[PDB]
Amino acid sequence: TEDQRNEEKAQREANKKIEKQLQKDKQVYRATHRLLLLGAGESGKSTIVKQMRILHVNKVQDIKNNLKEAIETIVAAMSNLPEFYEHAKALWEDEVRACYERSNEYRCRVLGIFETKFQVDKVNFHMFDVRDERRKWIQCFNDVTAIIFVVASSSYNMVIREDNQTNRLQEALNLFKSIWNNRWLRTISVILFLNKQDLLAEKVLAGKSKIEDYFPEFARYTTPEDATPEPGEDPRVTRAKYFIRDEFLRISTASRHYCYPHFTCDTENIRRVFNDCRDIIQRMHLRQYELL
Amino acid sequence: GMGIVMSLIVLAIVFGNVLVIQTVTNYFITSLACADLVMGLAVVPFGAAHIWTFGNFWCEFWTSIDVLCVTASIETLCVIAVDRYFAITSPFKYTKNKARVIILMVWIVSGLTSFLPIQMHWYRHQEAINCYADFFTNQAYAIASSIVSFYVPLVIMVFVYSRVFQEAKRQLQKIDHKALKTLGIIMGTFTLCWLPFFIVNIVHNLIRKEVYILLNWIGYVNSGFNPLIY
Amino acid sequence: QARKLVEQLKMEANIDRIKVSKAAADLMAYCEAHAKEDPLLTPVPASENPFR
Amino acid sequence: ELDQLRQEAEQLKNQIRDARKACADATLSQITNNIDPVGRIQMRTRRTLRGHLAKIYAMHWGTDSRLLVSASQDGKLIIWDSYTTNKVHAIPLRSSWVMTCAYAPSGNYVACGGLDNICSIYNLKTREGNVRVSRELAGHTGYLSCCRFLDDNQIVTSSGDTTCALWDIETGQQTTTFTGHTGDVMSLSLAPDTRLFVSGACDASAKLWDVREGMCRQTFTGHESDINAICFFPNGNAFATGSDDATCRLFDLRADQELMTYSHDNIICGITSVSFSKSGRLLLAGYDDFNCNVWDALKADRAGVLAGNRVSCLGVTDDGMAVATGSWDSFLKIWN
Ligand SMILES: Nc1nc2c(ncn2[C@@H]2O[C@H](COP(=O)(O)OP(=O)(O)OP(=O)(O)O)[C@@H](O)[C@H]2O)c(=O)[nH]1
Ligand SMILES: CN[C@@H]1CCc2c(ccc(O)c2O)[C@H]1O
Ligand SMILES: [Mg+2]
């Protein structure tokens, strides 16, 4: 019984140590919260992470690579419609400006999961990051408390990388609808951002494109009665501003799920939206499972 | 002479608690169910003492059991309500080990102030001694038990449930019926079941002894509704 | 690039296609051969079972 | 012209289809219409296991048929012991996401996949105390879906980028690369001969590649939905397949024809995995409706049903005396 006794005792000791370690570790897993970003191409899902992680979390050669692609796009579309850098410097200076007006054609570049963790006085938050229309990886994220959806708002006229497919914003509306009705993600809350506020104000102010032109369904000319306009906001833009949000909410209100709209742009504004993210701690209070 | 007919009805109280008997908060319901089991089993024979005085220690046993069971159930309900308030009042809360300490502390503390004095000669005058050959009390021990078992938790329950109702209204308005009904079912049932007993006990002449036992029978009926309510 | 797929397809098709030749029987024969070996088909004795 | 060249392919395909049609002689049921049914059978949980904090995604039985390795959703591989229900190791993972597992035939290394496209390996019997990552491979895009060992120094991976590759751990580079699928590849299984391996794409198609040459040979297209699991018959001449719809089919390499389509009418859930038995008489399969069902190779009857959320993976010991099933309930069970 020499081999049996010593081996069994050592195995029991190892089991006890491992069980103690696992019990100690399992407490932190329940404590931490998880989020998950989504969105569309060129929406801005990952650029806010830079401003978000700057709050509490703690490439030069790669950046120049995207810079060259900037010069090629305008030159190539012209026909249809440091020696290299020194010549490009004159080209930047030489840049009629009608090429910029052709926005229909086609701060960081648009690039695996990049996980970011930041800690506060409250529980630290762990976030994820991400074409592929199959989306077969969506299963097995029922454990995430909230999904931070981000949608562009200044592109109601451009087109997706697949040219002449559909409206850039319309390509995001139907995608939200698909997320809304899913078997696995049937008990997850969704937060909406309406990014690129500054560009929208610049676009609408100087005439040119009209929402009624590209979107015929624009019967609502009067804003909702319970409207809290932004300080100094022009009445015309507010009707445009609330039009985007109401279109999303109609899909949300068609059918356990509670959607929250917002407005974001100014790193401190996102930081104010960060405190806004802290301010939205309603969902844990919200579940209220003991009927109440 | 239909007492036997109602006796089998009270026998059904044990079945529900037995069937009822997992989460951090769900461990507390075991304590409430356990107290009901003790009250259901012990009180049933002692309740049928009506045609009597089975033994000298028999009076000691019923006295040591009933007070312990009643105070344990009241304290357990108080603890459950406190935990329910604590869960939703403060998000980002800051344990099974803590729960085991909490449950053990409440039950042992309650029994100590009840079982020990009852067997430690806490009673009265010339009429009381003749009963030895009525659960008479003296030296304000009834007052202390009433203020430390059925009176004290009521204020805490009222405060915490008022806070919960205040928070619920705030949550509803932020969006721009059921809460009132559920809170009423949870609270008013216990209030209506237990307030008459404590009211009559403190009235201690002007109260008939025969009717007095009837109210204390109502409080024992509260055990049956305990499993179905939760 | 299409010619690459077509060339591969002809090579893949250039494979002998055997008849059934009682293919089920060959599958049946092996299954009938290892009837005793499988412990799930007929439960093992309690002493024989290493688990319990 | 590609279309002009495609005419020859279609005629050859028509030649392929007609010749494949010409191989039909009789159904499997007619040949198997004189067999004694296995009868009703049920199994009880001999051992239960616990200790995870999240869902289990995959597991692999050891060649010793005693130790099994399982991977959770928190990134914690733990090597168990079936006899004593006692853990042996708890290796934390650099990536919180894991989707596969593998156990070396020599019982030395454990390979773990992950949503991050890194097929990291581990060493279990080196020095003492802490275990250390041996090599990390990153020569692919997408997410991985399966990892098996040919030998102690060769691993086969199947990513989600319509690519199946063969790795060499010592050099950390792709020796070959197999392509041809038009969609994502979800699973594979090596052959008992350790010479061929088949992979089930997501486009209702299956293939049968060759390791040595590096080129495809056949293609079966019997289904109409996503394919989720594959397992070789012990004879090595056939392999079952589990699809998104409840139909499970058994094909055959020699006859190139699908033989038996296990018709399921009352069943409405989806398949998650399949696994055979030692004698090839039973075909285990888990479902998406929280329980499991056991089929027959030929008679096509529900021999038994095991219950105990969704099941995510199965397996059979090399000895054949036990069956293990995972789940998303953070608990793994044993059956016998
Ligand atoms: N003017 C302006 N540009 C913005 C704003 N937010 C984002 N952008 C730009 O949009 C880009 C979006 O890039 P990413 O964050 O990678 O998002 P994406 O392009 O949708 O791509 P993925 O994150 O890879 O899905 C940023 O790099 C910025 O250049 C904004 O508020 N104003
Ligand atoms: C015999 N009936 C007893 C008498 C005294 C008493 C009761 C209940 C709770 C108390 O704190 C008491 O002091 C009654 O159940
Ligand atoms: Mg990316």
Q: Does D86 touch chain A (CB under 8 A)?
A: yes
Q: Residue D207 is encoded by which pair of tokens?
A: 């293939």
Distance CA A141, CA A25 (A): 21
Instruction: Judge whether D255 and D262 are in contact, CB under 8 Å.
Output: no
Of D12, D31, D281, the CB nearest to C24: D31
Is the domain covering D2-335 a CATH 2.130.10.10 domain? yes
Which domain range does residue B222 map to? 3-229
Question: What CA–CA distance (Å, rounded) separates B119 from B63?
Answer: 9
CB B113 near ligand 2, within 6 Å: no
Starting at the edge strand that comes first in sequence, how are the strands of the sheet with D216-220 ordered? Answer: D185-190, D196-201, D206-210, D216-220
Angstrom distance (rounded) from CA B149 to CA B106: 12
Which of A187, A191, A165, A166 shows the shortest CA–CA distance to A176?
A191
User: Residues D275-293, buried b or exposed e (16+ Cβ, 10 A)?
Assistant: bbbbbbbbbbbbbbeeebb
Token output for A146: 């909230």
Side chain identity at residue D182, one-letter code:
T
H or E element in which residue D309 lies: none
Domains defined for chain A, CATH in brackets: 1-292 (3.40.50.300)
The length of chain A in residues reads 292
Q: Which residue has the tokens 């009250």?
A: B39
CB distance C24–D32 less than 8 Å? yes
**Which secondary structure element, helix H or strand E, spans residue D295, and what is its range?**
strand D291-296
Q: Which residue has the tokens 């005792």?
A: A9
Beta-carbon count within 10 A of C25 CB: 13
DSSP helix/strand/coil, B94: coil
DSSP string, A173-236: HHHHHHHHS-STTSS-EEEEEE--HHHHHHHHHT-SS-HHHH-S-----S--SS--PPTT--HH
**CATH H-level, domain C1-51: superfamily:** Transducin (heterotrimeric G protein), gamma chain (4.10.260.10)
The answer to whether A160 touches A166, Cβ cutoff 8 Å, is yes
Residues 6+ positions from D155 with CB-CB distance below 8 Å = D102, D111, D119, D121, D147, D148, D149, D166, D167, D169
Give the tokens for residue A264: 């974001």
- Other Cβ atoms closer than 10 A to D264: 18
Which two tokens mark C15?
């494979």
Q: How many CB atoms lie within 10 A of CB A239?
A: 17
Q: Are A41 and A153 in contact (CB under 8 A)?
A: no
Q: Which chain D residues contact residue A112 at CB under 8 A? A: 116-117
Which residues in chain B have Cβ-Cβ distances shorter than 8 Å to A292?
A: 88, 164, 168, 178-179, 182-183
Tell me the residue type at D187: S
Q: Nearest CA to CA, how far is D177 from chain A (Å)?
A: 21
CB B189: neighbour CB atoms within 10 A?
A: 14
Tokens 């293609």 -> residue:
D219
The CA distance from A122 to the nearest CA of chain D, in Å, is 22
DSSP-derived letter for residue A115 is -
Domain locations in chain D? 2-335
In angstroms and rounded to an integer, the radius of gyration of the C-alpha atoms of chain A is 25
Experimental method: cryo-EM
Distance CA B196, CA B215 (A): 7
* CA gap D59, A49 in Å, rounded: 35
Strand pairing class (A33-37; A125-127): parallel
Q: For residues D90 and D76, is the Cβ–Cβ distance under 8 A?
A: yes
Kindly list the residues from chain D whose CB atom is less than 8 angstroms away from the CB atom of residue C41. Answer: 38, 277, 279, 281-282
DSSP state of D244: S
The answer to whether the beta carbons of residues D53 and A31 sit under 8 Å apart is no
State how far the alpha carbon of B24 is from the alpha carbons of A43, A77, B69, B83, B228, in Å.
Answer: 42, 65, 23, 10, 20
CA D280 to chain centre: 16
Q: What is the distance in A from the centroid of ligand 1 to the CA of B117?
A: 75
Task: Determine the residue of chain A that is closest to B89 in CA distance.
Answer: A285
Yes or no, beta carbons of C28 and D298 under 8 Å apart: yes
CA distance readout (Å), A191 to A57, A171, A246, D46: 21, 19, 14, 47
d(CA A36, CA A130): 8
Q: What whole-number distance in Å separates Cα of residue D83 and Cα of residue D47? A: 9
B85, B93 in Cβ contact below 8 A?
A: no
Rounded to the nearest 5 percent, the helix, strand and coil shares of chain C are 45, 0, 55
DSSP-derived secondary structure letter, D253: T
- What is the number of other CB atoms lying within 10 angstroms of the CB of residue D250? 22
- Among residues D2, D25, D96, D52, which one has the least CA distance to residue D328? D52
**Contact exists between C and A (3 or more beta carbon pairs < 8 Å):** no
Q: What are phi and psi of A22, to 5 degrees?
A: -65, -40
User: DSSP assignment, residue A167?
Assistant: B
CA distance A172 to A182: 17
Segments in chain A forming alpha helices (H): 2-31, 47-56, 60-80, 83-94, 98-101, 170-180, 197-205, 211-214, 235-254, 267-279, 282-287
- Cα-only R_g, chain D: 20
Residue with the two structure tokens 């496209």: D117
Atom from ligand 1 closest to the CA of residue A130: 25
For residue A101, report the distance from its CA to the centre of ligand 3, in Å. 29
Instruction: Kindly report the number of other CB atoms within 10 A of residue A69's CB atom.
Output: 9
Tell the burial category of D147 from Cβ atoms under 10 Å away from its Cβ (0-12, 13-18, 19+): buried
Q: Would the CB atoms of A113 and D88 count as touching at under 8 Å?
A: no
Amino acid residing at D65: S
CA D208 to each of CA A203, C16, D250, D257, D280: distance values in angstroms, whole numbers, following the listed order: 56, 16, 14, 14, 20
How many Å apart are CA B209 and CA D132, to the nearest integer?
A: 80
Residue C27 host element (H or E): helix C23-33
> Which residue in A214, A191, A217, A190 sits closest to A203, CA to CA?
A214
Looking at residue B77, which CATH number applies to its domain? Answer: 1.20.1070.10
Interface residue B171 vs chain A (CB under 8 A): yes
Q: Which two tokens stand for residue D229?
A: 């699991």
Other beta carbons within 10 Å of D111: 24
State both tokens at A258.
Answer: 């509670």
Angstrom distance (rounded) from CA A20 to CA A12: 12
Q: Which atom of ligand 2 is nearest to the CA of B135?
A: 1
D96–chain C nearest CA distance, Å: 34
Q: Note whether D157 and D144 are within 8 A (CB).
A: yes
Q: What is the dihedral of CA A66, A70, A71, A74, to 10 degrees?
A: 150
Instruction: Judge residue D143's burial from the number of C-beta atoms within 10 Å of its C-beta, 0-12 exposed, 13-18 middle, 19 or more buried.
Output: buried
The answer on whether A108 is annotated among ligand-binding residues is yes
Report the largest interatomic distance among the alpha carbons of chain B, rounded to a whole angstrom.
Answer: 72
DSSP assignment of D153-213 equals: TEEEEEESSSEEEEEETTTTEEEEEEE--SS-EEEEEE-TTSSEEEEEESSS-EEEEETTT
Ligand (nearest to CA of B149): 2
**Angle between helix C2-13 and helix D2-22 axes, rounded to 10 deg:** 20
Rounded to whole angstroms, how far apart are CA atoms D119 and D157?
Answer: 8
Mutate to test the pocket of ligand 1, among A36, A47, A49, A194 (most ligand atoms within 8 A of CB): A47
Contacting chains of B (3 CB pairs or more, <8 Å) are A
Residue ranges of the domains in chain C?
Answer: 1-51
* Contacting residues of A for B184, CB less than 8 Å apart: none
CA of B150 to the centre of ligand 2 (A): 10
- By most ligand atoms within 8 Å of CB, the mutation choice from B58, B62, B135 for ligand 2 is B135
Which residues are near ligand 3, the ion (C-beta closer than 5 Å)?
A 130
Of D300, D268, D306, D259, nearest in space to D283 by CA: D300
Chain C: partners with 3+ C-beta pairs within 8 Å: D
In chain C, the residue whose alpha carbon lies closest to the alpha carbon of D38 is: C41
All residues of chain D having their beta carbon less than 8 Å from the beta carbon of residue C28 are: 31-32, 35, 298
CA quadruple D52, D58, D62, D66: dihedral positive or negative?
positive
CA B107 to chain centre: 12
**A128 CA to centre of ligand 1 in angstroms:** 16
- CB proximity under 8 Å: A 168-207 to B: none
The Cα–Cα gap between B82 and B92 comes to 17
Give the pair of three-digit tokens for residue C50. Answer: 């290493």
Residue D61 burial (10 A CB sphere; 0-12, 13-18, 19+): buried
Q: Give the number of domains in chain B.
A: 1
Residue in C20, C22, C30 to test binding to D, most D beta-carbons within 10 Å: C20
Amino acid at A230: E
Residues of chain B contacting residue A290, judged by C-beta atoms under 8 Å apart: 84
In the block, tokens 């809350």 appear at A189
Rounded to an integer, what distance in angstroms lies between the CA atom of residue D334 and that of residue A236? Answer: 67
